[PDB]
Design a protein around this ligand. Structure first.
Ligand SMILES: *[C@@H]1O[C@H](CO)[C@@H](O[C@@H]2O[C@H](CO)[C@@H](O[C@@H]3O[C@H](CO[C@H]4O[C@H](CO)[C@@H](O)[C@H](O[C@H]5O[C@H](CO)[C@@H](O)[C@H](O)[C@@H]5O)[C@@H]4O)[C@@H](O)[C@H](O[C@H]4O[C@H](CO)[C@@H](O)[C@H](O)[C@@H]4O[C@H]4O[C@H](CO)[C@@H](O)[C@H](O)[C@@H]4O[C@H]4O[C@H](CO)[C@@H](O)[C@H](O)[C@@H]4O)[C@@H]3O)[C@H](O)[C@H]2NC(C)=O)[C@H](O)[C@H]1NC(C)=O
Ligand SMILES: *[C@@H]1O[C@H](CO)[C@@H](O[C@@H]2O[C@H](CO)[C@@H](O[C@@H]3O[C@H](CO[C@H]4O[C@H](CO)[C@@H](O)[C@H](O[C@H]5O[C@H](CO)[C@@H](O)[C@H](O)[C@@H]5O)[C@@H]4O)[C@@H](O)[C@H](O[C@H]4O[C@H](CO)[C@@H](O)[C@H](O)[C@@H]4O[C@H]4O[C@H](CO)[C@@H](O)[C@H](O)[C@@H]4O[C@H]4O[C@H](CO)[C@@H](O)[C@H](O)[C@@H]4O)[C@@H]3O)[C@H](O)[C@H]2NC(C)=O)[C@H](O)[C@H]1NC(C)=O
Ligand SMILES: *[C@@H]1O[C@H](CO)[C@@H](O[C@@H]2O[C@H](CO)[C@@H](O[C@@H]3O[C@H](CO[C@H]4O[C@H](CO)[C@@H](O)[C@H](O[C@H]5O[C@H](CO)[C@@H](O)[C@H](O)[C@@H]5O)[C@@H]4O)[C@@H](O)[C@H](O[C@H]4O[C@H](CO)[C@@H](O)[C@H](O)[C@@H]4O[C@H]4O[C@H](CO)[C@@H](O)[C@H](O)[C@@H]4O[C@H]4O[C@H](CO)[C@@H](O)[C@H](O)[C@@H]4O)[C@@H]3O)[C@H](O)[C@H]2NC(C)=O)[C@H](O)[C@H]1NC(C)=O
Ligand SMILES: *[C@@H]1O[C@H](CO)[C@@H](O[C@@H]2O[C@H](CO)[C@@H](O[C@@H]3O[C@H](CO[C@H]4O[C@H](CO)[C@@H](O)[C@H](O[C@H]5O[C@H](CO)[C@@H](O)[C@H](O)[C@@H]5O)[C@@H]4O)[C@@H](O)[C@H](O[C@H]4O[C@H](CO)[C@@H](O)[C@H](O)[C@@H]4O[C@H]4O[C@H](CO)[C@@H](O)[C@H](O)[C@@H]4O[C@H]4O[C@H](CO)[C@@H](O)[C@H](O)[C@@H]4O)[C@@H]3O)[C@H](O)[C@H]2NC(C)=O)[C@H](O)[C@H]1NC(C)=O
Ligand SMILES: *[C@@H]1O[C@H](CO)[C@@H](O[C@@H]2O[C@H](CO)[C@@H](O)[C@H](O)[C@H]2NC(C)=O)[C@H](O)[C@H]1NC(C)=O
Ligand SMILES: CC(=O)N[C@@H]1C[C@@H](F)[C@](F)(C(=O)O)O[C@H]1[C@H](O)[C@H](O)CO
Ligand SMILES: CC(=O)N[C@@H]1C[C@@H](F)[C@](F)(C(=O)O)O[C@H]1[C@H](O)[C@H](O)CO
Ligand SMILES: CC(=O)N[C@@H]1C[C@@H](F)[C@](F)(C(=O)O)O[C@H]1[C@H](O)[C@H](O)CO
Ligand SMILES: CC(=O)N[C@@H]1C[C@@H](F)[C@](F)(C(=O)O)O[C@H]1[C@H](O)[C@H](O)CO
Ligand SMILES: [Ca+2]
Ligand SMILES: [Ca+2]
Ligand SMILES: [Ca+2]
Ligand SMILES: [Ca+2]
Lengths: 388, 388, 388, 388
């Protein structure tokens, strides 16, 4: 009925509780589960759902062979009920393509999918399940977007896109949509040197995005957006607790306005919540590969270049595979504050598990608690040997 | 609540963006996907869906053997959610038969299915999911209809049927339905010599249908219907850009009131949008078989017998299989103009791929953009070898 | 909102058009289709659905072995969308048991299922999907009911039950329910000597049921019920066109008040519409087995002991298997008259096809047309050899 | 719209009629049925559903190997339509974990799931399908709850939890929730010495729970809760008809305020309805293992230490496997009294049937009748040999 406004602050995050888990690869060993990757979670006013990019085959299907590849004509943004797996029979297609974002503005949902060949890709912006706007590639090098939910305020839903090199300067733009129409766009500003795969959340009329500098940085770039003024800025997380992957060992002092060097041309989508002393960072446990996952409480990470952990929680053990991670919240929940949430993609199959010819994932997701809760670890749980 | 009226003109068509794609044959390699053919797309006021004729077996089922055949007691018009595949578990049966059409009038949906033996077929006209009217064969030779959506204006939904020879004169009728009841019917008039499988769209209170002259023409016949007066006329597309299949090579000058000769007794369902300079024609790329698919901008194709392409877009490469194609639009979208859409049926299996014993298809669909978007090609994507 | 009243007469029946067909055995060869028997069709105010008794296993499942048996703890009344097959994933359980009926009163639905051992069976009467009333066996010999829909008038839904011998006198009762509560019951009256499996329809505030005299009659008993007075009578169809199975050859003169002899202790559920000159009878084509199915127009069949066919329609060829048949109508359709409908159960597997270890069926259904439509035949269509 | 109040008494229980049965293990032999255990039934105002703890694999899936284990990261509370089986495609996840409860307060549903390692478990309390409250382990030894529905009165839904030893004193708490928030909690009081797995029902503004004393008692502890005062008491069922399993032979005189000795450190979840002369107890038929199931009418069982059976009903034969059992009622049914209902979990596979590597169950459920109905027995019905 009305556009949602970001009128609340974050709840105090004292730990993380289990929210959803689909066990998709376990279940899909003997049921019609679609192969996916690049999952996320997004809420409507009356339901929260899982989202991902399908590969247009089931996991036991012979067409699962080759699904390490990111971009084909067989991919689509799908959604399905929370903690169910993405099946052929329960998955709803939001739009067609191989990079996406989606968010609800309080009245209805906007979904964006990009498709095409590398040098001629286009975004289609859907609103109320109809296409409304299209945007052609501006740099002819894999036009691409967040791979997790966007955020709206009074109808304005900003979205970050990048077109251009993954290993050098690229052209990043912030589009401000309303009802699927372009109100404005701006080129990236501030000190972030490279942006991909922004993970965003909204509180007190400001949207914060934690992104991936694929080119040089092992610290994460941060974009902060004012959706009323339709302006933004950028920087890096100051903290020496480095949250990209792969990455060097953690130093004692980080960088606020430059990439922290030591690994080039690689990364992973990740997130954080940056809320002064209530600041929590996610990362892989391994510095070398996408294994394990942990949350660290790092007070003032955004602004304090010597900030270190005061608390933490293990989400996935370093002996289990992780993957992309991102933020979402239920903006329509009851109460006085928005409860921080996140997901972690649990990648299985190639390239790390190459006895199978496929790559897919399952999902785990948590939300914050004001209690100090006991921790478990949450692995995918499938046995690869069963698929041989 | 109210009957929809065709009050808008076409949006300007500068390119085509991806709308839906089901990847059904890929997915159906290892899931309970129904064998189909003769698909299309049709919108309700709150949802757009895929439609097709089921063959009453799954593709991996042993009853898929023999599904090259067009007309059996096991066929039905089914619908399913946009870009999902047609599964046993998500497909809704609209009516029983082996030729169909369907459209929503703004209040509810009319669906028409024809069944029976060749010499004794009948149409049943369903409205609000109940049968209302029946029409018996008038020429005793495969009574048959559009195989894509009809169009309504203020409750009046015209439909084109043909009964009689596929390779000689036949008896074509235009029925004007309202609430599933016959208001009137007329015998075909104008200069079209043979009509099958009309593909129709509505704008500014007129309905335009691009059809298949199976007998003689490689140019397509066009029927234009005034749904208020309940009258029509017919002609051929004047343009030397010929759009049937198979067909001769394109000449320099076409025919406005006669079939363009060079192939007899064969054809394929196709479509066009005929809107002066905003005119786009679809066709197979091959002159000999149903391979490839392209859209050509041919200004004034309907009326200019020397009109040639000023722009185009490849939809399916000539090294991939195509099939039937047809028009639809979302008459209930927001904005000032109706956005042209189309689908292409991607036929797999027999007769061209005869290592399998079945014939089925998947679907790809696009809508127009006012941008000049980059093009991809959109093949079915299944590997036949997997099915051996 | 209001209880439906039977205020209309039957439409004129000049032929029969296809209404629904599920092709369940064909589809179930390679999908999760439940084994059933004793199907029927019943309408709500906004939807019509297929109903049957599940056997609590899929057809390809190993538990399909033994499903020739009628009565087990694994059976349930299920419903599913019209012309879909009865799948594990789309079938809704109405109640538990091995004999049933169901009807909608205009406000909500009553469903009745009987379960138990032969000598200690009970009916549970569900209303608005909650159990309301229970009725214990009165004769300790397979309490049993219609196996097709009941009919309501101003909230009163009569139902016919039988308890006692299948091959001798039994105790038949007519229960008058309202909101799932017993208003009254009466013992069978009139001249019918044995009653099973009544097939009923409603018009002009009277309900007519055509039943099965399993003991002696090859003519069918008829019960006529006044749901306002809550009284009834019974007789047999007078016509020499005999409609049970198995049966003797047709004579020239039938019996109005006694069973027509020649076969004992056997029969099949069937139906008719008895409406003076607008009278149509269904029967198997074979006198010996459940093969084929036809509709015969037999003017005044109910009252004229020499009435013979003036018109007919083949539904299933005598070279294809049939089974139970029954009546239903869409009481909530638009227009001035109720359109007669029926289904035929197409039994496959045992005992006639004993290369498989199972018994199941599919469904075909038709409704009347005021046109004289061409006829097709409508077989199950599955190849038993595929299941070996 | 309004919170439900427990304003009715129990209906008179003269027998039990069949309510639901899913036949899940039979069906799951050849369909995508999830492995479960710890099932129950719970009603909303407009629907009643089956609930259980999934094991996050199908039964025919290779991940079914190991599902004898109770607590893993792959478990979730799921619900599905009454008498359907718990499939991958129709099951809705309520929350994540390995111990649960759920109930509807008349406005919306509260669901509670506990997860974590044995020494660090936490409960998350969901309301209106959103997490609201979290509760950390207080004794660091398998925090755990009812495994059947809770009950609400004017918004207050008490829930019994236990944390601590299964074979010695433990710390049991009664939490009083409203809208998912903690109003109050109390430590267990009265004479019950050990509490697990309470099975609860509501009548005349009091909630009665029949639980499992795993430590010493073969008589069942009873907790009675006043949800207005938010106080409770506890005792044991006085009757010498002992209802735990395993258990000693029945004596002539029971114990009201102490555990009845003879078996230690073991038990099974069970239930009763304690309503003076209208008192019925459920139990396994075997004293040694979870086989068979029966209901006994034991007047004044709660308060009369010599009460013996005056009537009974066999539910499952002693030659068939049983399991957990629990109470529920449809608080939103029509009429003057609440109809007592229960389910029995039918465990198949390990440990008793160790030719398979899995453990799962199906469900049977009954409700009371004021008739004296005939009895059947209701086994799971699957053949283990089919799974070899
Ligand atoms: C039941 O559940 C309980 C709740 O989950 C659980 O208690 C939790 O226990 C975990 C695990 O111990 C805690 O997480 C850690 O928290 C550390 C921070 O807390 C310490 O430091 C604070 C400041 O100096 C102290 O205040 C704090 O003391 C307080 O709390 C204590 C309880 O833990 C209590 O005893 C005290 O009385 C007091 O009240 C405490 O001392 C945090 O630092 C740690 O993370 C590091 O360690 C991990 C390995 O264990 C790494 O994976 C992680 O990345 C962090 O280390 C790395 O990064 C650092 C920053 O750069 C570097 O300095 C390190 O060298 C290290 O870097 C290497 O590794 C990196 C990752 O591979 C790499 O990238 C680098 O390159 C380099 O190679 C962890 O998060 C949690 O806070 C506890 N929570 C609560 C509420 O108590 C309890 O144990 C469970 N109970 C049972 C019985 O099982
Ligand atoms: C990123 O995506 C971009 C958007 O898709 C893409 O740009 C697009 O590129 C495609 C492919 O080149 C274009 O499609 C073609 O358009 C042709 C018409 O445009 C030409 O002619 C106009 C009039 O004279 C000119 O105005 C126009 O110039 C303008 O635009 C230029 C850009 O392309 C630009 O450089 C100029 O500066 C200027 O501004 C341009 O010259 C169209 O004619 C063509 O279709 C024919 O060719 C196809 C084969 O390629 C056939 O498949 C097709 O059927 C047509 O040829 C056949 O039919 C004709 C008519 O009868 C016959 O005359 C021909 O002989 C031929 O007939 C044979 O084949 C038939 C089919 O098999 C057969 O039936 C006959 O029997 C006979 O055998 C094609 O549609 C598109 O318009 C571009 N779009 C845009 C917006 O620019 C860009 O390339 C992509 N970028 C990258 C980096 O990959
Ligand atoms: C396109 O579709 C059209 C519509 O479906 C289709 O036309 C239809 O054609 C069918 C098949 O011919 C017709 O069905 C039959 O109708 C018979 C009754 O009609 C005749 O009798 C009337 C009265 O004397 C005449 O009025 C009537 O004449 C009129 O109509 C004619 C068109 O058919 C036309 O030419 C005339 O000008 C005139 O206007 C006509 O002569 C009906 O009797 C028949 O049923 C019997 O025969 C079946 C075998 O074919 C049996 O299966 C069936 O059970 C009936 O016979 C059995 O039972 C009788 C009664 O007891 C016995 O007397 C018989 O001996 C026989 O009994 C044996 O078999 C029993 C069953 O096994 C058994 O139990 C007994 O023991 C014993 O062993 C049939 O229903 C239909 O009416 C036509 N409909 C229309 C609108 O015209 C047209 O053919 C199709 N076109 C093409 C090109 O394919
Ligand atoms: C059609 O369906 C009808 C409805 O279901 C069905 O009739 C029902 O029949 C069943 C089975 O007979 C009845 O259930 C039993 O009811 C017994 C109680 O009723 C008796 O006792 C009363 C009081 O003294 C009498 O009033 C009553 O008489 C009345 O009713 C009669 C009809 O049955 C009628 O003939 C009379 O005229 C009169 O009107 C009647 O005599 C009940 O006691 C019994 O349960 C015990 O027995 C079971 C074994 O059969 C055990 O499994 C069960 O656990 C109970 O015994 C155990 O526990 C007792 C208590 O501690 C011990 O004293 C016993 O020794 C025994 O203990 C051993 O076993 C335990 C379990 O393994 C173990 O833990 C111990 O350690 C020890 O090892 C049973 O529930 C039912 O009430 C009938 N219902 C109705 C309405 O009539 C009819 O039969 C069906 N018809 C056909 C044709 O099939
Ligand atoms: C259950 O009892 C409560 C307490 O008496 C009822 O609560 C009142 O409901 C009315 C009407 O909806 C409100 O206007 C009052 O404010 C409520 N509270 C109190 C404390 O009186 C409630 O309606 C009852 N539930 C049902 C289904 O009748
Ligand atoms: C899932 C897994 O086994 N990850 C291991 C953890 C650890 F042993 C590690 F050394 C690490 O990176 O910390 O290697 C990982 C993994 O085997 C490699 O990094 C990549 O193969
Ligand atoms: C799908 C496909 O391979 N089509 C080819 C394209 C081309 F090579 C062509 F020569 C053509 O017709 O243009 O043959 C098609 C096809 O192999 C035949 O036409 C029919 O088999
Ligand atoms: C389905 C089928 O083949 N039915 C035949 C028809 C006919 F040949 C008939 F002789 C008949 O009864 O009319 O036998 C049936 C069937 O084979 C037997 O009656 C029973 O097996
Ligand atoms: C399902 C089953 O066969 N249960 C039997 C019943 C009975 F024979 C009994 F002796 C009993 O306990 O009463 O053993 C059960 C079962 O075999 C064992 O108790 C445990 O294996
Ligand atoms: Ca990086
Ligand atoms: Ca042609
Ligand atoms: Ca008989
Ligand atoms: Ca015990």
């Amino acid at each position: 009925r009305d556009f949602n406004n970001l009128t609340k602050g974050l709840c105090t995050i004292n730990s993380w509780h289990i929210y959803g888990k689909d066990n998709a690869v376990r279940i899909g060993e003997d049921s019609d589960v679609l192969v996916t990757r690049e999952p996320y979670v997004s809420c409507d006013p009356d339901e929260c759902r899982f989202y991902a990019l399908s590969q247009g085959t089931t996991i036991r299907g012979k067409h699962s062979n080759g699904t390490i590849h990111d971009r084909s004509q067989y991919r689509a943004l799908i959604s399905w009920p929370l903690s169910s797996p993405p099946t052929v029979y329960n998955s709803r297609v939001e739009c067609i393509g191989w990079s996406s974002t989606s968010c609800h503005d309080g009245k209805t949902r906007m979904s964006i999918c990009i498709s095409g060949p590398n040098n001629n890709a286009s975004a289609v912006i859907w609103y109320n399940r109809r296409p409304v706007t299209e945007i052609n590639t501006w740099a002819r090098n894999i036009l691409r977007t967040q791979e997790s939910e966007c955020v709206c305020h009074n109808g304005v839903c900003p979205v970050v896109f990048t077109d251009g090199s993954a290993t050098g300067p690229a052209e990043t733009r912030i589009y401000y949509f309303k009802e699927g129409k372009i109100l404005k766009w701006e080129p990236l500003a501030g000190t972030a040197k490279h942006i991909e795969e922004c993970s965003c959340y909204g509180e007190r009329a400001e949207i914060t995005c934690t992104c991936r500098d694929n080119w040089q940085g092992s610290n994460r770039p941060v974009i902060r957006i004012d959706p009323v003024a339709m302006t933004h800025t950028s920087q890096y997380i100051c903290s020496p607790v480095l949250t990209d992957n792969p990455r060097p060992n953690d130093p004692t002092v980080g960088k606020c306005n430059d990439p922290y060097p030591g690994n080039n041309n690689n990364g992973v989508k990740g997130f954080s919540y940056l809320d002064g002393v209530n600041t929590w960072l996610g990362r892989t446990i391994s510095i070398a590969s996408r294994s394990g996952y942990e949350m660290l409480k790092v007070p003032n990470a955004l602004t304090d270049d010597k900030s270190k952990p005061t608390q933490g929680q293990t989400i996935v053990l370093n002996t289990d595979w992780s993957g992309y991670s991102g933020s979402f919240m239920d903006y329509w929940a009851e109460g006085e504050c928005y409860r921080a949430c996140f997901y972690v993609e649990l990648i299985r199959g190639r390239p790390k598990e190459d006895k199978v010819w496929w790559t897919s994932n399952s999902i785990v997701s948590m939300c914050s608690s004001t209690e100090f809760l006991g921790q478990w670890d949450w692995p995918d749980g499938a046995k690869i040997e069963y698929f041989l």
